[PDB]
A paper describes a structure:
We purified SlNRC3 activated by PVX-CP and sensor Rx in the presence and absence of AVRcap1b following transient expression in *N. benthamiana* and used cryo-EM to determine the structure of both complexes to understand how the effector could be interfering with immune activation. As in previous work, we used mutants in the MADA motif of the N-terminal α1 helices—which assemble into a funnel-like membrane pore in the resistosome—because they abolish cell death induction without compromising receptor activation or oligomerization. Upon effector or PAMP recognition by intracellular sensors or cell- surface receptors, respectively, resting-state NRC3 dissociates into monomers and assembles into resistosomes in a stepwise manner. The fully assembled complex inserts into the plasma membrane to trigger localized cell death and limit pathogen spread. Previous studies have established that paired NLRs like NLRC4 and NRG1 oligomerize through interactions with heterodimeric (NLRC4-NAIP2) or heterotrimeric (NRG1-EDS1-SAG101) complexes. In contrast, oligomerization of NRC helpers doesn’t involve additional partner proteins. The helper NLRs dissociate to assemble the resistosome independently, with no evidence of sensor-mediated nucleation.
Helper NLRs function as central nodes in plant immune networks. Upon activation, they oligomerize into inflammasome-like resistosomes to initiate immune signaling, yet the dynamics of resistosome assembly remain poorly understood. Here, we show that the virulence effector AVRcap1b from the Irish potato famine pathogen *Phytophthora infestans* suppresses immune activation by directly engaging oligomerization intermediates of the tomato helper NLR SlNRC3. Cryo-EM structures of SlNRC3 in AVRcap1b-bound and unbound states reveal that AVRcap1b bridges multiple protomers, stabilizing a stalled intermediate and preventing formation of a functional resistosome.
Author numbering:
A (entry chain D): 19 to 137, 143 to 891
B (entry chain G): 19 to 137, 143 to 526
C (entry chain B): 395 to 526
Write the structure that this text describes.
């Protein structure tokens, strides 16, 4: 009949899914190790392409099946279109099945090679010995740290990105005269990624005993005992463990190092931060070479003892600055430049293709070094790490945005008690721990705020993702390479663009297999009105639309045909309402709009999007009515909703909060007077009482945009506030400091932020106690002039800042006695505040000089040169 | 309808491209190493031929699809011709697909052999020791360069084309009395293309210590330390690193050579110019034997201590001048001539087929030596190097013309920020760095202007391209061989001609 | 290391013990009856099926995979429980590797399973919100 077609193509769908299970298992097995056989790599590419096309067809089938339920809404016209679409996906599934059958029939040999898989020398690294550049201060610091410490065995770890020069520094320390005199016994051990403990112990024994054939039947435990005897009979010993990769390796090798109270030391180099953290609470992070040091190293490597020719100085320096201070990159470039003609033209050519040289000329040198860390990544983390290469090199990627993108792209599959955001944060922490991602900024609470990949790893990610994995492709112009044609655009899965977006869209590209458009450019671009429908028309299967840097003036109807869309980022200066047709995108997870208008109206039923997770805006959003007809009488709950960033005060009813039991972050902007005003009924509990019903709420932000505060406001009692609230932000709300005491009764409060005169009043004295877990306090642009506290008022305060608060007179001296205080910021303050800060510093110096343990307190005043 | 045929043949085109991806991967894997099995080589030739025909058919299909847009310009007459052409390429694609299917069905065994590929002794080279010809001045120059220098470890590299005689000069220096007196310690190390650092260090230790079984559990780092101790306890030391192939080998081996301010020296022979440039800013380029020296070497190799017969002097000299001063070519010719009858007729016959002798009589001697450098070429550079054999031997090929030809023939595939000309120039620089191509003239700005291949490598390129790869074929007359017929001309992909073009 | 040394017929019996909530005390009589009902105990000798299941439980206890919390005055096992960490291992093996049984719960973002995966569930373990 009419509906027989859906079942007929579904019959093929289960068989396609059965084949996909085998192909995904084949892909995972092939990805377990790096295949060098060309036929195997070609087969893997073919399997991955047919798999990705299969997911695209299955996703289209799922959308068609979901939309089939709306036949009654449009009658015959929709029936005809649905029949044509169902036939279209039917022949797409058939074509995929033919390709799968062809792969099974013809490519059986590679399938055998992976399934059975019937099919090395340990290469100790060689490093610079004499001309080590820029490591004088680092070596001196580590040597001084080796000398001083406890009498037990202590480990000094050196951590960093691959190729940073950890082994070069370790060998420089190993040959340093001061430790050649201090440490009578010096042992170098190469603890490779793979190693044998028996071989390690016999190697250590060989340093002392020439005859080692008598240990043929000696167990490894007795070998460790013999190593302990050999090392302990002398004085101090320094042992260098090179390239330790796992915690188990250190735990299993350290049994051979005796404890004698002789201040024995172990210097360990590692790429893993967690291993370093376990072995020492303060791992030594190896520094990057400065631009001058990078040029000096390149000059020494290329021209030996001689200076650079004057004509090659400027191009060479430009090359060194493009190496980003990584000694391995500088060495590779020097090897490439030595084979050149020592002319300005060729050096400039190298400067324009630094990455290509660093990767493709000699993959045996550096590409293998990076692959050592990359191949140890878990299979689910490889895609996440390669995603980081989409953003331009050197750009700072927000952790929140990267986490949301990972969740939207489906990389994060998880079913336990933790949220998807927590799992993605754990993935980011794992990447950072392996030193594959560098954290550039952290929040005051310890979270990662922005992170970036080093330029050389970014080049490696671009290489792997574009030429090997076909994960994403980049579009650009300027040189002979133009915008891609339809033939290769038909095979592109994700599209990264940075500039000339309207020019690219004017060509009406084909994006039938494109599932991600990432506008990674920083410049805000006003899209022409005639080019607005270009994005949905070009890419019907768009799953991720990161158009945050693109300003849209209107919503075209084709935007509502993106039923696979999960991530939205849009900027706008004209949009005031969200059309109801936007609710047809039932797969939306993250909805971000950045509108300059005062108010925004959510006419679309976001409650229908059961998979919705974030609604992040900057203007006051009016949520749609929760009243639903009898056709949808069931009490659907948006349990996956985590963020309601800028909802209206009048929409803060108990109705919306019932539908959002797991809301973590909440924010309100507008007439907050309506939030605090009691209802006309007898009970005085207003709409703010509904906020306290959110058990999982942790973040609250209130923005009072109106200045008609003729009636003073009162904070509700503390028990009305959420019990598990951990962070509160207030700005331009015009409260009074007498209400701070209410906030002091919050048991779980940790971070409090007041901006643009959140509280009003000159002075206010708090009693002892309160704020049990508060750690971060931020004040900016306030009228406060006096503030009295006590030592017990802030037991756990760590951060304290006043910005442009010249009206403040002094601070309590009890703050100087706070054990957990680490940093205070004073900006554009009066000279009296500066003198009080100097007195606090002098008191801290005297207390440290009294003989007790150093507190480690630090104080900063900016600008430093003011008051001179 | 009328346009249904284009889509129908395009449906076969995607399947043909899918098969071509597998076949190209198979060809790349087979080209990774030199197969000796005859069935495997025949299958590789069959796959390559069917691949090349497939590209020809696909190119014709692309041209037909592009020209289909001009139907309105010539109406029915062009429509009829386009239909006939579309049918013609349709049956060509069908025939290619049948051949691909036949290869898959019948030749599965060789495909297994390449895909799984389940299936040596280091041969230290032997060189002339007593009758070294023409290297007196070169040896004296290198010896004087070894004596003078800084107090640190300095490397004197000897570079040249394969078979030039770098090891012969190195051994002559190694046995020279002046350095046997100047350098108390002399060590010869054969750093082959493949080597083990532990074996190298143990070999060096064996020069000084007879008992080496106590280093069973000693790490390679401590072995290098022991080598440093053994070498440093004496005076100056000279160490000969023979046939160093890569920069990593020198970086990884030099850790065992101590610095004492005693003017220690390392004499290294290499075929790579970049390795020599890194180890010393002024590498010593080994000279070619002159025509008189080539004849003298040939006379010594063939007639031992005796002079050549007067009747064989003129033919022999003509042979030596055809060896182009390469000692390896002279040695191979001498081996071939010793088995001859020492008559003018046979020597003249050898003079007319010098290249054939230098390649085919004893492939075990020289063809393997050239294949050592050739097989290390990247897969995309092998076709570019073999192209250089199209031009006549001894001719000077302009670099600009060669670069343009490489780009036109589609050898240069590149997508980065550099231009195609820059990539082709980098390919030419890589070929020159491996001493497979000799630069004869450079522009004042440093660019390569004209380059030529040595005659013996040119013969090797002709051998590989005509009989193994079928890259190009040469057309000539004058001897019993006439212009090719239709049967073999139907299989020729590129045509090189030099004379009698109108005929 | 201990799990792989289990006999093939004891692996299913041990993984069954993970169905009950962690830290709960499982009656030996109830566990034996459940094992017999689920067909794990196949036996044809002179002993009863209850005796064979009791022997299986004794074997599990002997390997210290199951802890006996109470014994009858006659020496029989009355209640036994698995340590929480082995219970987590049993949950891991049974849900993600063997598909022996699946657990249904709510409270966090994970809701009741849909028809697609419920169609593949062989055994259903539930603890709360049964009427819902
Ligand atoms: N300060 C330096 N001056 C000159 N060259 C350096 C310096 N630091 C490192 N290098 C060079 O950089 C390359 C890599 O450095 P190194 O061997 O120390 O790596 P690493 O940080 O230990 O990395 P891995 O984790 O891969 O072992 C080597 O070729 C080394 O010579
Ligand atoms: N001056 C010479 N007089 C006589 N024979 C020579 C001379 N130079 C080289 N030969 C001969 O040429 C052949 C190759 O020379 P040689 O072994 O020195 O090669 P090479 O330049 O070191 O090359 P490779 O890079 O292949 O090791 C040998 O058989 C050697 O005897």
């Amino acid at each position: 009949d009419n509906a027989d077609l859906i079942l007929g193509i579904q019959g093929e769908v289960e068989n396609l899914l059965t084949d996909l299970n085998y192909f995904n298992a084949f892909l995972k097995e092939a990805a377990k190790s790096r295949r060098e056989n060309e036929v195997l790599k070609e087969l893997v590419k073919k399997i991955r392409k047919v798999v990705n096309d299969a997911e695209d067809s299955i996703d289209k089938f799922v959308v068609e099946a979901k939309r089939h339920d709306d036949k009654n809404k449009f009658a015959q016209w929709f029936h005809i279109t649905h029949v044509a679409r169902a036939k279209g996906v039917a022949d797409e599934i058939k074509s995929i099945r033919e390709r799968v059958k062809e792969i099974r029939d013809n490519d059986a040999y590679g399938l055998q090679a992976i399934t059975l898989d019937d099919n090395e020398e340990r290469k100790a690294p060689v490093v610079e010995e004499d001309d080590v550049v820029g490591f004088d201060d680092e070596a001196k610091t580590v040597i001084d740290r080796l000398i001083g410490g406890s009498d037990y065995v202590e480990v000094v770890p050196v951590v960093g990105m691959p190729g940073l020069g950890k082994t070069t520094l370790a060998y420089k320390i190993y040959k340093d005269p001061k430790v050649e005199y201090e440490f009578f016994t010096r042992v170098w051990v190469y603890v490779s990624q793979t190693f044998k403990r028996r071989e390690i112990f016999l190697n250590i024994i060989s340093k002392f005993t020439r005859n080692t054939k008598q240990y043929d039947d000696t167990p490894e435990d007795d070998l460790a005992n013999e190593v302990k005897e050999l090392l302990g009979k002398g004085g101090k010993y320094l042992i260098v463990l090179d390239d330790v990769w796992t915690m188990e390796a250190w735990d299993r090798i350290k049994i051979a190092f005796p404890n004698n109270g002789k201040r024995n030391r172990v210097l360990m180099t590692t790429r893993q931060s967690n291993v370093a953290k376990r072995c020492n609470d303060k791992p030594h992070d190896l520094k990057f070479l400065t631009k001058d040091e990078s040029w000096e190293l390149l000059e020494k490597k290329v021209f030996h003892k001689e200076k650079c020719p004057p004509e090659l100085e400027l191009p060479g320096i430009s090359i060194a600055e493009k190496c980003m201070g990584l000694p391995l990159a500088i060495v590779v470039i020097a090897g490439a430049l030595i084979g050149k003609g020592k002319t300005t033209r060729e050096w400039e050519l190298v400067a324009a293709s630094v990455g290509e040289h660093l990767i493709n000329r000699d993959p045996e040198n550096c590409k293998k070094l990076v692959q050592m860390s990359y191949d140890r990544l878990p299979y689910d983390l490889k895609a996440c790490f390669l995603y980081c290469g989409a953003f331009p090199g050197g750009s700072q990627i927000p952790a929140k945005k990267l986490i949301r993108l990972w969740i939207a792209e489906g990389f994060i599959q998880y079913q336990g008690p933790l949220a998807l955001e927590d799992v993605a944060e754990d993935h980011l922490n794992d990447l950072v721990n392996r030193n594959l991602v560098m954290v550039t900024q952290r929040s005051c609470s310890g979270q990662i705020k922005t992170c970036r990949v080093h330029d050389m790893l970014h080049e490696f990610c671009r290489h792997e993702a574009m030429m090997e994995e076909n994960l994403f492709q980049e579009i650009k112009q300027g040189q002979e390479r133009s915008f891609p044609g339809k033939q290769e655009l038909a095979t592109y899965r994700r599209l990264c663009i940075q500039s000339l977006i309207p020019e690219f869209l004017s060509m009406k590209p084909s994006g039938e297999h494109v599932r991600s458009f990432l506008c990674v450019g920083s410049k805000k671009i006003d899209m022409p009105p005639n080019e607005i429908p270009s994005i949905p028309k070009a890419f019907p299967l768009l799953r991720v639309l990161d158009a945050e840097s693109i300003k849209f003036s209107r919503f075209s109807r084709e935007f509502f045909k993106l039923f696979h869309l999960r991530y939205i980022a849009l900027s706008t200066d004209k949009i005031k309402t969200i059309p109801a047709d936007f609710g047809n995108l039932w797969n939306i997870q993250t909805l971000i709009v950045e509108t300059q208008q005062a108010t925004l109206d959510i006419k679309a039923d976001i409650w229908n999007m059961t998979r919705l997770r974030h609604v992040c805006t900057n203007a006051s959003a009016t949520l749609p009515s929760t009243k639903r007809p009898k056709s949808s009488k069931d009490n659907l709950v948006n349990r996956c909703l985590q963020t309601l960033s800028t909802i209206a005060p009048e929409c803060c009813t108990a109705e919306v909060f019932t539908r959002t039991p797991n809301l973590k972050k909440l924010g309100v902007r507008g007439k907050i007077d309506a939030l605090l005003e009691s209802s006309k009924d007898g009970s005085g509990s207003g709409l703010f009482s509904n906020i306290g019903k959110l058990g999982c709420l942790e973040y609250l932000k209130l923005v009072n945009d109106t200045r008609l505060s003729s009636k003073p406001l009162h904070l509700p009692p503390a028990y009305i506030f959420p019990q598990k609230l951990k962070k509160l932000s207030l700005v331009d709300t015009w409260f009074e400091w007498k209400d701070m005491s209410i906030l002091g009764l919050l048991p779980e409060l940790e971070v409090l932020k007041l901006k643009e005169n959140a509280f009003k009043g000159q002075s206010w004295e708090q009693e002892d106690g309160g704020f049990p877990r508060l750690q971060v306090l931020w004040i900016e642009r306030t009228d406060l002039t006096s503030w009295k506290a006590s030592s017990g008022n802030f037991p756990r305060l760590k951060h304290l800042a006043l910005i442009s608060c010249d009206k403040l007179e002094e601070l309590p001296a009890e703050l100087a006695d706070v054990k957990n205080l680490q940093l205070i910021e004073l900006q554009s303050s009066s000279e009296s505040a500066a003198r009080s800060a100097r007195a606090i510093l002098k008191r801290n110096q005297e207390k440290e000089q009294d003989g007790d343990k150093g507190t480690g307190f630090k104080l900063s005043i900016f600008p430093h040169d003011l008051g001179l």
